[model samples]
Target: GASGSERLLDELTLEGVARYMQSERCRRVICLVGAGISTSAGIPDFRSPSTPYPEAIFEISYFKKHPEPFFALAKELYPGQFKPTICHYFMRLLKDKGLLLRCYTQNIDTLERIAGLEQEDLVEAHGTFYTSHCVSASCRHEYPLSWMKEKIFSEVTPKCEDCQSLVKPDIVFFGESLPARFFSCMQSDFLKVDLLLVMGTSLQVQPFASLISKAPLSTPRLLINKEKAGQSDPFLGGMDFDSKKAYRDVAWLGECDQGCLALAELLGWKKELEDLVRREHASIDAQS
Candidate 1:
């Protein structure tokens, strides 16, 4: 029996996953992450309970009618203001080890880039505040995050330098489709993913949520999340973590950073990850 292909490892534990990752069999690791990864960095709750239409600001129709609320919130949530957490560094460490095939993030915080993951290593599934676009149909001029930040922090609505229209960050609103790269990359990356590591997300959103099942059956899936999710339900076929057929699933419940830290310890990357975080946070502080 070729258990090597049938099951990446015999046990469904963090130690087992760490050992498998150390082995050659677990080469390409794809991380499907969500807002939880950036929560430690203090990205504010987007859907603030105080506001009735807290999510309205992210919808295209609402933003088109009223862009101020969106920009007002953007200044607080913008990149460079916050530090990347340990979970972020863990992904970067994986990349450094040549094990990270891709990091698919559902967050718009842009912390992945700040944590040192290159553009090639990431898929910003919901788009990002790292880039902006003019809202005019005729003038879809692109602006970098810096340009938008300057305008936002200055207490002025960003107007297109060329066409005199409002500027909005590239974060995907309710009406928008996810970035083209999201679909294109997912199609290829999941096929070869040897290990699927999920973290910080409830896996509720569609398409992105569906990615949990996209990998091959024998490819081990580990969820280092605060709560159990993606389990099989009446409405959908899911991870089936507790089912008899679920030999390849592991659920390590805890905070995203803590879970990542634990995994790093087991993988012998604890010091490496810790050092990276300390050094990077220091650099970030120095710059500010």
Candidate 2:
């Protein structure tokens, strides 16, 4: 009978995360996020059949052959147009309370920015739509978001000022290596993390999905999502299963936005969260 633990994780729930959040020493929270977190904002996933090029547009060589389709799609995917959900704002709440260690996200939507999370608070795992650069390896010329917007709406292939090369958003196009920052911090950050919250992601993607396994055993990990993620995940079941089932963290299985609202209420952050939501709406309206 493996019964030496205080919390039984056989089937963990939001309570697991909520309980640990109360600890003053649990200041560093490592968040592994994905597109499911942003679905509430009416932004479709990258591989959604409804998307312009569907799946091929993200390919780097595909872009080199025809940059127009991808840029055309970016017109729809650009930031500022879509609002961040309460789940996105949850990171902001963590940031405000100084509990946020880092938000490692697979989303390129930049809703994290809309949620008032600073660059230092986030690790855009797949890059973002905020900037663009020339495709030429030698040129390395990057353009601002404004420049990308102009070309996106105008439906024109933006040329590099120096070399007339086609420009593309800085997102991690397929066949391209991920950002250096992802590696720069992942090792150090995950090694000693006291708490980890994985939300909205299916943990299906490689490299990005492996982040959870990096944390040492006994570190509390919680998952808030629509369904149970990582049934086949090696890391999920790979932990010390020989011990009692309650040795691991719990999963708050449900919608991202709704789950966040419920958690905020439980954590006594409802008012604070609503305030952030209101301000976010106001800013979106101001853009109009």
Candidate 3:
């Protein structure tokens, strides 16, 4: 069935993928994304060297002992300060067209939400800056984004109003589990995914990286990245798009914004995406 499987896809080009995206069968396009999509807006990726123990900053154990460094870094990468890149808007556009199934992002920056996507449109696997809670086991009181922002900029570690314990963003730290929604959503979304559009991530992280392999083999996988990622590993699984037996995979290598721009053009949504970015950015700038 080698040639039979090959017959499932005529070609694995961007044009070929775009044709599928434009078809009636391309209703649910799930996007798996990461920090590379946000770097255009001046946010750094997870791998960037920032501190002597940069990884510790996100560790729950370290935050419980010294939350200052985490908050300090949080203040710099806080959500409101940046604009959503064209890549973000492109995902929103996909939703507008009723093709977006769900966007699972590893970023805590909330750029996808800023791009006009709602909570229902996403599965923030790494938790998010959108909400915070009391660190006290007995008092997991929740707080909003603005409250945390206010406390951070005021140089005060946010404390739960009710319990007076440290209030930290819900971002999934190294010693913590992912958001509850991540697992529940994955159970349903992957089964319905027609197109798996992975973008801007190295896919080096666990559980999240394994997501690239969850979709059915018949589902087309598209990668838009600077370099190949999700290479096979012993952990769980990895991308098999390059194998001689592969038929339903395509790779478009480049920066996230440009890669998304090309896809938008091919899907005949170039003007729509440009207009959305311009209008939204203008509104954001006007507020500033």
**Model 2 C-alpha lDDT per residue in residues 67-156, reported as the tens digit of each score:** 778877777666546789999998899889878889999998888987888898888889987778888889979998878789888888
Model 2 spans with C-alpha error above 4 angstroms: 1-11, 48-55, 76-80, 233-244
Report the lDDT tens digits of candidate 3 across residue range 1-288. 232454334578788899888877778999999988998888888585561576888789999989999888777756546699999999999999999999999998888998999999999999888899998999799999888889988888888889888998888888898888999999999999889899999888888988988887778888998887877765643566677766787888899999999999998899999999999999988884
| lDDT for each residue of candidate 1 in 151-190, tens digit (9 for 90 to 100) | 9889799999999898888888999999999999999998
Order of models, best lDDT first: 1, 3, 2
Model 2 TM-score? 0.88
lDDT of all predictions: 0.86, 0.79, 0.86
- Using all chains and alpha carbons, the TM-scores for the candidates as numbered come to 0.92, 0.88, 0.92
What would the TM-score be for candidate 1 when compared with the true structure?
0.92
Model 1 clashing residue pairs (backbone): none
- Model 1: how far is 38 from its true place, Å? 1.0
